[PDB]
Design a protein around this ligand. Structure first.
Ligand SMILES: CC(=O)SCCNC(=O)CCNC(=O)[C@H](O)C(C)(C)COP(=O)(O)OP(=O)(O)OC[C@H]1O[C@@H](n2cnc3c(N)ncnc32)[C@H](O)[C@@H]1OP(=O)(O)O
Ligand SMILES: CC(=O)SCCNC(=O)CCNC(=O)[C@H](O)C(C)(C)COP(=O)(O)OP(=O)(O)OC[C@H]1O[C@@H](n2cnc3c(N)ncnc32)[C@H](O)[C@@H]1OP(=O)(O)O
Lengths: 359, 359
């Protein structure tokens, strides 16, 4: 199996959102990932590209046979991933303490939103809930409107699966001294809070306020925002540094002497009005040309369906084609032990066949 | 030094955004992290909490002595992090090949937005630019408005630092088998694409559209969005699963029989209006009480300044008091080798000291 995690063995108790995303990435980087789903489920080969780089197996974990086979897989593996509510694996007989009895090398990775304990620890939730409690959601969107969810990128993935991954891999490094596994407790409410550490840093030094839409990086700054062009499509401007901002102004045709200072916040309304009228005067693809190879920090805001036509995307093979759609190639990239193209979802395998393989 | 990464040595070439965030998380988990800044920028003790769990040293990397001292660190280290444009470390004489001469075990980690090669590889940029090219930014915000940046959470951190960490720690695992380092190439345009793999998966199966504000998780669904309350504050609703949705309706006082179907998208505007009126008739904290211990997936949207007073946050110690204010405690969490509270940024030390300390 190609990639730096060749030889790493992972058991994933099938759930939704962060658990499978983390499992995907371990698979992507060469891990041997076996996913146990319920029989009531799997009516064919999966159509869900997120289940790439998997072997799927079926097993009623409520039955004693189910549990036994499961504990035999875990015995032969380096990592377990579960993202059920706290208590669920315990009650199945697949809890950490049970796992520690058949494999004290196990990295026992627990993916939740609220964490393992505390008042919300049994409440159902999704991304939007976890980021609502720690200040993140409130910071996202225009100042004249209610907050807008940043899809499920910040709680589920950035602050969720990715922290689970770092935990697993950090724990494997620990396991190199100690010869012992341990439990990784990844909660979206915690990981997302470390994800936004910069805002907490800036808040402390007076460089970030709680007012939505009134900061340097939330859309409040005219030089860090999107602009509507003549065709109704958009560009993004990120020209924070003064030298990049000056480069942007020259490409737009605006003389710096006729504008308010870049960082005179009291005159941001005027500045925005000027930049707005300028970008509105030509179409997105015009601005893409003007600013290609410039440091002006102006880029076209492409829709998903146009991404496959962008030269920089094509040339670095950020994406590959698979069963009626582009999908992203593994990230990040490795010079010597490169990942390979992901293996698509495969039909279910037998749990005995797998135990054989793992010897 | 507490945490799973005790004994890991990291040299960080000072930069902005994702590199410092990665180095911070490594530090948080107990890595020994030495950050080389330039003499010209360091003054007092840094007031940037992102620089916690560091030793800071200065050095003109353009001098003969600075280059030498730096190469002697890297000789003794496990990982190097740099986040300059491609070619920059090569020209300083700190490129991968030069480092491979003095330490074939080094994990050489390169954090960029656009990657190591390709047409955009020398273009200045910020988060908003990287996420504009791969479809992410276009998908964020309300449908009748221009896209809104989700701060710098998705390119810099979620698809940036976190992928640099996954690559560093995966490469360390590969090293245990191979005896050798390698180069990790973490590009924000790639990582953020993998971060949003769920949308590409959903797009392939006809369950995600390129129309902004018309999807299950972008704010277009009335059961996955924020709602303004009687007091002008907000709740988040995340009631995707029909059973949680039913529980929310009961708590709102709304008879399901009176309402359009949860997932009849043609009638979402109509459903939204009914839910809007309901949420508007009481204040945020009222809804917080009503739905505590519920699976209705309704949570108060707290501003940063309110987070310190939420019971669930307090009791799990998601934050600690610092210097200027509250900061996120390390994530994720480890049962056996737990992280300690971060060490605040401490004054510049002398590079020779570190070399003594390390050899
Ligand atoms: C993309 C998205 O929408 S992402 C979801 C975001 N949330 C999270 O993942 C955080 C994790 N915590 C949670 O909130 C939950 O996982 C939820 C809310 C997503 C699901 O809630 P629930 O449906 O109550 O599931 P919960 O995790 O509590 O339990 C799963 C059940 O399946 C059972 N189960 C698991 N695997 C199997 C199996 N192979 N065969 C049979 N039963 C099984 C468990 O034993 C449990 O039954 P029980 O609780 O009645 O004893
Ligand atoms: C918070 C935010 O907004 S963060 C996200 C920003 N984006 C990225 O990080 C992507 C990757 N990095 C970059 O694209 C760039 O570093 C930018 C766009 C951020 C800034 O561009 P530049 O200012 O041109 O920096 P670049 O990386 O090209 O080079 C930095 C210079 O610092 C110099 N330098 C670095 N360390 C030292 C030192 N200790 N002493 C002296 N000089 C030093 C380098 O030698 C280089 O000099 P040179 O090109 O003049 O030979």
């Amino acid at each position: 199996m190609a990639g730096p995690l060749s030889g790493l063995r992972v058991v994933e108790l099938a759930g939704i959102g962060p658990g499978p995303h983390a499992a995907m990435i371990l698979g992507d980087l060469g891990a041997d990932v076996v996913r146990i789903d319920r029989p009531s489920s799997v009516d064919g080969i999966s159509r869900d590209a997120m289940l790439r780089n998997r072997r799927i197996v079926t097993a009623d974990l409520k039955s004693d046979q189910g549990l036994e086979l499961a504990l035999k897989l875990i015995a032969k593996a380096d990592v377990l991933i579960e993202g059920y509510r706290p208590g669920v694996t315990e009650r199945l007989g697949l809890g950490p303490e049970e796992c520690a009895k058949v494999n004290d090398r196990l990295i026992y990775a627990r993916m939740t939103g609220w964490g393992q304990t505390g008042p919300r620890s049994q409440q159902a939730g999704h991304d939007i809930n976890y980021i609502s409690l720690n200040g993140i959601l409130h910071a996202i969107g225009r100042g004249d409107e209610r907050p807008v969810p940043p899809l499920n990128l910040v709680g589920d993935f950035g602050g969720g699966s990715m922290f689970l991954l770092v935990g697993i891999l950090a724990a494997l490094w620990e396991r190199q001294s100690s010869g012992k596994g341990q439990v990784v407790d990844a909660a979206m409410v915690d990981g997302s809070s470390v994800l936004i550490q910069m805002m907490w840093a800036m808040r402390a030094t007076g460089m970030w306020t709680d007012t939505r839409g009134a900061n340097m990086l939330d859309g409040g700054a005219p030089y860090y925002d999107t602009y509507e062009c003549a065709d109704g499509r958009y560009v993004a401007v990120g020209a924070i540094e003064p030298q990049f901002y000056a480069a942007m102004l020259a490409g737009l045709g605006l003389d710096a002497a006729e504008l308010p200072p870049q960082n005179d916040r009291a005159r941001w309304p005027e500045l925005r009005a000027l930049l707005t009228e300028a970008f509105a005067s030509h179409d997105r693809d015009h601005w893409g040309a003007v600013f290609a190879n410039s440091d002006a920090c102006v880029t076209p805001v492409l829709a998903f369906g146009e991404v496959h036509n962008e030269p920089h995307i094509i040339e670095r093979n950020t994406f590959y084609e698979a069963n009626g759609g582009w999908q992203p190639m593994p990230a990040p990239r490795f010079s010597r032990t490169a990942s390979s193209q992901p293996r698509p979802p495969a039909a279910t395998i037998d749990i005995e066949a797998v135990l054989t393989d793992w010897d």
